[PDB]
Amino acid sequence: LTGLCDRFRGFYPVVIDVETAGFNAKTDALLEIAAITLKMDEQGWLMPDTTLHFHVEPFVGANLQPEALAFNGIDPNDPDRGAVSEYEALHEIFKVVRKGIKASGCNRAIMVAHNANFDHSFMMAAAERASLKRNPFHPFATFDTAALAGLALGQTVLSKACQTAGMDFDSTQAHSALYDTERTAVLFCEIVNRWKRLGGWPLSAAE
DNA sequence: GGCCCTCTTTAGGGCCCC
Ligand SMILES: [Mg+2]
Ligand SMILES: [Mg+2]
């Protein structure tokens, strides 16, 4: 291929997972976020690059759903969380992403996530509140690993997709931002690498 | 949390992005 900028029409894939206090991106709090950039080796194989992870303070006036907190087991009132503002978390992620875009020769970043619209809507909403400028992510395009796993593995559930792909998946570590992002990143890389392995990529190898 | 299905309506379990 072999360069990352040539693989997805100049899009720089960044794996994202968020933990929230509900399903409403407009009103519910962002509590946690992890980001994993990708890279290709000289042979053209995809693999994780830089990993970021932040605990996030609920923005002022945010709604908190008890059922959501019960699911992710996150206590926003814990002073020992080490949480930062949405601004600080996303500002650092954007900085690393813009740096990755520049070095790779890509044009823009695209979010890779499982059921990606969820994570995308929450990140865009948080960027709006924090008044962040020059959002390096595509405003509506995403790489949904649920759809990709549907094609590649015939499974749409993250746990099952990883297992089907022959990956390790610990249910005791599941539903945590860093672990979910890492497993999603490996899943996405495996799907992409498998397609190359089967001769589906490059298009000349599609033959 | 709330919609969906059915071995349903005097119910609960699946869903599986929180
Ligand atoms: Mg998730
Ligand atoms: Mg998660």
Author numbering: 7 to 213
Give the exact sentences the study uses for this entry.
RNase T is a member of the DnaQ-like 3′–5′ exonucleases with a DEDDh domain that contains four acidic DEDD residues (D23, E25, D125, and D186) for binding of two magnesium ions, and one histidine residue (H181) for functioning as the general base in the active site for the hydrolysis of the 3′-terminal phosphodiester bond of a nucleic acid chain. RNase T can digest both DNA and RNA and it has a unique specificity that its exonuclease activity is reduced by a single 3′-terminal C or completely abolished by a dinucleotide 3′-terminal CC in digesting either DNA or RNA, referred to as the C effect. To determine the molecular function of RNase T, we show here by biochemical and structural approaches that it is a structure-specific DNase capable of digesting intermediate structured DNA during DNA repair. RNase T has an ideal dimeric architecture for binding and processing the 3′ end of various structured DNA in diverse ways, including duplex, bulge/bubble, and Y-structured DNA.
To reveal how RNase T binds and processes a DNA bulge with a blunt end, we co-crystallized RNase T with two bulge DNA molecules, one with a 3′-end TC and one with a 3′-end CC sequence in acidic conditions, pH 5.5 and pH 6.0, respectively. Therefore, due to the low pH, the bulge DNA in the crystal were not cleaved by RNase T. The crystal structure of the two complexes was solved by X-ray diffraction methods at a resolution of 1.8 and 2.0 Å, respectively. In the RNase T–bulge DNA complex structures, the dimeric RNase T bound to two bulge DNAs, with the 3′ end of DNA binding at the active site of each protomer. However, in contrast to the previous duplex DNA complex, the aromatic side chain of Phe29 was inserted into the bulge and stacked with the two neighboring GC base pairs in both of the bulge DNA complexes. The crystal structure of the bulge DNA complex revealed how RNase T can overcome the double-strand effect by inserting Phe29 into the bulge so that the 3′-end scissile phosphate was moved accordingly into the active site. We found that the active site of the bulge DNA complex indeed had an active conformation with two bound Mg2+ ions, and the general base His181 was located close to the scissile phosphate. The crystal structure of the bulge DNA complex also revealed how RNase T could overcome the C effect. The 3′-end cytosine was paired with the 5′-end guanine, and this base pairing prevented Glu73 from interacting with the 3′-end C to induce the C effect. Therefore, the bulge DNA could be processed by RNase T without any sequence preference. Moreover, the 5′ end of bulge DNA was not hindered by any residue and could further extend, suggesting that RNase T can cleave bulge DNA with a long single-stranded region at the opposite strand, similar to those DNA in the frameshift DNA mutations (see Discussion).
